[PDB]
Predict the 3D structure of the following.
Amino acid sequence: IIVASYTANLAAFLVLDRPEERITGINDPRLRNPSDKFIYATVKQSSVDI
Amino acid sequence: GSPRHTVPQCCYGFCIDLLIKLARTMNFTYEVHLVADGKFGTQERVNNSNKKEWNGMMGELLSGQADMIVAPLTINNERAQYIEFSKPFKYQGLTILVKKEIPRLDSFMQPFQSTLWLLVGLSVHVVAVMLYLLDRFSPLTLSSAMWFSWGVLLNSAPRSFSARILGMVWAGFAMIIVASYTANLAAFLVLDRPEERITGINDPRLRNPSDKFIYATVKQSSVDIYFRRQVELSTMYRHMEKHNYESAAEAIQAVRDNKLHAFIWDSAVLEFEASQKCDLVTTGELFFRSGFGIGMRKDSPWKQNVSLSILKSHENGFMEDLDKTWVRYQETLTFENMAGVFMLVAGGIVAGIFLIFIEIAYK
Amino acid sequence: NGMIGEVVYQRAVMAVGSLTINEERSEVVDFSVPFVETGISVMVSRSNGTVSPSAFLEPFSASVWVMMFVMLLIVSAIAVFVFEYFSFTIGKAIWLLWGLVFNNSVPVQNPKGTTSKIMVSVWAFFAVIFLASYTANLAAFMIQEEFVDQVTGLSDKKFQRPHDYSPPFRFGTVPNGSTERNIRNNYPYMHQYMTRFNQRGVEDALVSLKTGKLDAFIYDAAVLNYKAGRDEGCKLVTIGSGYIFATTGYGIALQKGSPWKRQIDLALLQFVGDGEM
Amino acid sequence: TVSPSAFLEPFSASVWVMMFVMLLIVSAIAVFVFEYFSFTIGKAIWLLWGLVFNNSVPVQNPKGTTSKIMVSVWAFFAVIFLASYTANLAAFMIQEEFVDQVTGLSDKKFQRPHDYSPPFRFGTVPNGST
Amino acid sequence: EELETLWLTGICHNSSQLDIDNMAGVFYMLAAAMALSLITFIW
Ligand SMILES: *[C@@H]1O[C@H](CO)[C@@H](O)[C@H](O)[C@H]1NC(C)=O
Ligand SMILES: *[C@@H]1O[C@H](CO)[C@@H](O)[C@H](O)[C@H]1NC(C)=O
Ligand SMILES: *[C@@H]1O[C@H](CO)[C@@H](O)[C@H](O)[C@H]1NC(C)=O
Ligand SMILES: *[C@@H]1O[C@H](CO)[C@@H](O)[C@H](O)[C@H]1NC(C)=O
Ligand SMILES: *[C@@H]1O[C@H](CO)[C@@H](O)[C@H](O)[C@H]1NC(C)=O
């Protein structure tokens, strides 16, 4: 029972809990309200800024 | 349904205890009765005067035959233009009740196709035959060779000078096959959760439905008015206008017998019904978080202190007591899947004992 | 004082900003209809923890154990019959099948009477079934992460006295807040133990909950929900959604006798009744 | 399904050589103990790689204490890399994709459907700009 | 983009069974084992 639980536990570590940790949704208001480390940038004098 | 049958019976429950609390707080008497129809009341065109009128509880209230409506008041913009409201007692939204509860032998031998067992059997037969022929050309002998060929597969030794490589490859073969079978059986029973829900009002498959997406609402209800004012519901309205049902229990019995497939209804009532009937799971997207209050008349001396008593019920744990009455009041197994496993085990044991009878009767 | 001091003393007109609604505020002014579900809730540290691997009752449920003993008795009786056909394995055939449940026992010399090898092959195939079933049982245990709640709700036994339990803790609110009046109208001792556990700022209490300078904190529900929705690391999944709590709403406070009540109420019902809210 | 090729070469390509290295080291230790202090000269490789799986293969009882220590260490090692092999099977199962049948407008199927055994079919709507 | 949100859908995105190819490759390794056993058997 111990070694089968150990086997299933080591099978359970690599199962991707925390699949995505960032703010990849564009309508997520952390884009609307940035922080000290949420650093997004653009090209100086480009069409994206306009 | 019934031509004329109106009797005094017993009434109790949530709003009855709310009325008991109102009578305990304030200083009045009352008389409890019911509405004739089973409808809320809609601003519907009547045949004469080209004017939309009301019916139901609103019809009995505007006629003066009703004094105070105590009901799950769907507080909306339409009814407030005609009567006055109270402050709400219940915070409750809308959700979709569907039937995604699909139960299950877990595909051991009989539901699954028989390539694996016949393949392993013919393979171990070929292995035992060539091991016995290598035992003949060595660089109960046949029974010992066959029993060792089973015992390498068994996972719980003859002359193998030029045969130990064959035995070790067969042993690694047997363990990698049973490991692959364990891995993909666990893999199939973990990821056995497909998409069977609707995901709220923003479902384009229900914006243009078909003959399988059978969804409706209560006939002549405020939910139909709320969908009729909004313009992105009209096609759904054209689906719902032909299958509207009178009471919610009609919808329960319909979608339980799969006459329906989805139903728009209040959240906590469907939570209570899911506590009652364990085969009911609502969707995830909660939409239109609404409020239930008390249907009231216009400017009246029973408007101020009544709402103050409602707020007095909000500030203390009496709402929690009402939750304790009805809201909080809720309700590899190897007995269905591995039962046929035990049946085939017992049948194989009986057949093996019969073959032992034949073997003893022969020798 | 504040917005109540502006509206009641009529230096302002209405309270458009966010404001809780309770009894004496409804005494001094006339509110509008509520529009947003903003109760109260409790934010704690609520770290990772474990997944609580207590036990397992899925394969056997205290009734397949009878089937195991019956199969042991059948195997022992057939082994007695085989050894009668062919002097130390009367009750030791039970141990022979019973140590080979987990296929690592002392190897007893199996008889060549063709019966015992068949029943050992059947039991080994059953072993192939149930070790896979145990891996399935733990695989059905790690589906989604969980963390047990130290506090069930506002009626917690830990809220009586933290000295009764072996870890003591602490709970806070906002100073001069309506939550304080809601507590003092409900529980005096809660206010008494909160008085020594005061704080100043909302972000200050947030840092005190993150850095361990505060254990529990009591505030309005939806504000803490929005703060958890923007949380650095998102390590704050609160207890429920405000079920054992005050469960109130927000509105607009108007002066007693203002003619703007019905129009603003109809406008709020229009703003909710079209999906614009 | 995803239809994988096998489970040996895309998974154990740099591990298999070191597993043979440890196998030869343990077999050399077994031969050195068998010659230092009945068939642990050449059959020990078959014995050791049968201790990888332990599929009910009775071999012998090792009278050497060093042999029993190596059996214990090799059994614990076999359990833990069997656990890692099941974990890697799960990790290969975690992703889900679908292999495309036709991966080009210049496909070899598009020359003639006699090239493959099922005769496939494809058409258009008439009078179209396509 | 609002009209693309209104007049399109995006819920559809991009099944367990025994692979046939895996034990086929194991059978190729097995046939190599038969070949090596025959080579060691004839000499
Ligand atoms: C409360 O109700 C009773 C009902 O008979 C009535 O007689 C009494 O006058 C009421 N109390 C007051 C103070 O109004
Ligand atoms: C049609 O018109 C009459 C006019 O009095 C109205 O009373 C009646 O309700 C309508 N028809 C029905 C439903 O009998
Ligand atoms: C409402 O309650 C107040 C006391 O809080 C009382 O003075 C007043 O008469 C009541 N009005 C009515 C008619 O309910
Ligand atoms: C709270 O009220 C007290 C009353 O003395 C006083 O400290 C001050 O007015 C307020 N302080 C804070 C923290 O708001
Ligand atoms: C294409 O258009 C022509 C003219 O209408 C028509 O005769 C022809 O049948 C069309 N093609 C087909 C096969 O639909």
Remarks:
- Chains B and A do not touch (no CB pair under 8 Å).
- The first helix of chain B runs from residue 14 to 25.
- Residues B 27 surround 2-acetamido-2-deoxy-beta-D-glucopyranose (ligand 1) (CB under 6 Å).
